[PDB]
């Protein structure tokens with residue numbers, strides 16, 4: 001009541017209060033049974049790429065997207081993501097992926 | 100989907116093409132657990148205000 | 150109560166005038182040591 | 188805070204970015220209230236061989 | 237059920253608290269309306285047989 | 286509750302049973318006492 | 327690093343200045359030269375930034 | 376039924392809540408309507424403005440509901456004052472007032 | 475414990491002003507709660523967003539202060555109309571109305 005009314009003194013009556021009593025202390029993460037590595041080598045390390053007039057669309061599915069494996073071999077000059085931050089990308093699932 | 104709330108058993112049927120279930124548009128209410136396909140609906144961490 | 154459970158006050162069968170309105174026909178007051186009664 | 192990186196990793200300095208520098212080497216806090224000053228130094232740091 | 241719940245309460249709880257105080261005043265106003273209309277004389281008499 | 290995004294309804298302090306009791310008392314007093322009901326005894 | 331490498335592989339020196347603003351007494355300031363103080367007058371003031 | 380006037384009040388109450396929850400349906404020009412989606416998809420520094428926009432729309436909805444409740448409470452208070460006048464002047468005593 | 479109504483009015487006014495101060499103390503999603511700070515350390519074209527965020531947040535807080543004053547003034551008007559009707563009937567005349 002002192003926190004909700006923002007005052008040390010509280011007058012006689014009944015007061016509705018905001019929830020400060022419960023603070024969580026555990027974290028659970030549930031993600032599907034996927035362990036195969038995504039074919040990042042095929043879409044990043046191919047000898048031949050199609051031109052811009054016919055851009056090549058590749059479906060990515062049924063795998064786990066670990067972006068770290070890409071740090072060692074290559075470095076990306078531009079990495080700009082819209083709608084999703086570069087952070088929390090590894091903590092977040094993706095429904096439909098086309099490269 | 101990230102959140103802080105109580106999880107309880109759901110008796111709501113889900114069609115195969117849909118994953119989440121929002122009773123009110125603003126808040127997600129139910130989810131399909133990925134490892135076990137049983138439906139799990141999310142009740143708030145706090146109940147009705149004391 | 151019909152409004153909900155009350156913990157922290159003692160229920161008495163005697164009826165007095167309402168001081169703090171709990172609701173659903175229940176009220177609370179500070180009376181005699183001294184304690185909150187519903 | 189002074190260090191030396193590559194050209195591609197300069198964008199990794201900015202807060203909210205991910206990379207080999209951001210995750211494992213140097214991470215700006217989300218609410219950074221400061222400046223980042225980067226300049227090319229091919230004549231000084233780089234040497235033949 | 238947001239992750240950063242306490243920060244949201246700290247930044248935006250007093251505004252909602254004022255609105256909830258207004259709604260509680262509405263509820264007390266309607267209760268007092270019932271008390272004024274129905275409870276005018278507090279004497280209770282048995283129904284005649 | 287959760288479905289109304291936190292909008293709950295508060296039950297009134299005067300329940301329908303006590304309201305019916307108040308109306309029964311008013312009817313009994315109006316029939317049996319005239320206008321001497323509210324003036325004390 | 328090699329001097330014949332591309333612009334992405336050339337060295338870049340990065341200095342990150344981190345500072346807190348208007349929450350503490352200041353030990354470092356800018357190029358603005360201080361003027362005389364005026365008391366009890368409606369005037370534009372710049373006190374410690 | 377000539378009693379449906381009170382029904383109107385009940386219906387009006389329900390109608391207000393219906394409109395209120397419809398106001399929770401809109402995202403108020405944000406990325407997503409759901410709070411948790413905005414928390415999960417974006418890093419916090421991009422997310423303060425989106426959270427501010429979304430819950431500011433929600434709080435404006437609550438304020439508008441408060442104003443509508445106050446209008447209907449003024450009408451109900453006027454009707455209750457009239458009914459209490461009928462209680463004091465006609466039930467308890469005889470009224471010479473016409474009509 | 476007599477005279478509780480007048481003391482309740484005074485405490486309600488004090489609580490309304492205190493809640494106004496506590497709402498106004500919030501930063502309303504801006505960089506800093508102080509307007510002078512975000513004039514001093516931010517150039518105007520991107521500063522205007524923080525300006526009107528903080529300012530409209532403060533103004534909205536006044537709106538809810540105004541509406542709380544409105545419902546309190548409605549209750550006070552009900553009590554004052556009761557008092558005026560009593561001064562017209564109880565004091566300057568004899569009322570047959572019971573209780």
Ligand SMILES: *[C@@H]1O[C@H](CO)[C@@H](O)[C@H](O)[C@H]1NC(C)=O
Pocket residue numbers: 040041044045073
């Ligand atoms: C790409 O292929 C080359 C040649 O096999 C290899 O040396 C390099 O390590 C590969 N990079 C990745 C993505 O593993």
Ligand SMILES: *[C@@H]1O[C@H](CO)[C@@H](O)[C@H](O)[C@H]1NC(C)=O
Pocket residue numbers: 032033133134135
């Ligand atoms: C995932 O694997 C674990 C361990 O074998 C198993 O217990 C669980 O049921 C699996 N879930 C599925 C089938 O998606």
Ligand SMILES: *[C@@H]1O[C@H](CO)[C@@H](O)[C@H](O)[C@H]1NC(C)=O
Pocket residue numbers: 161162
């Ligand atoms: C009040 O009356 C109830 C009737 O069920 C009884 O059970 C209870 O013990 C009484 N309480 C007392 C002793 O005041």
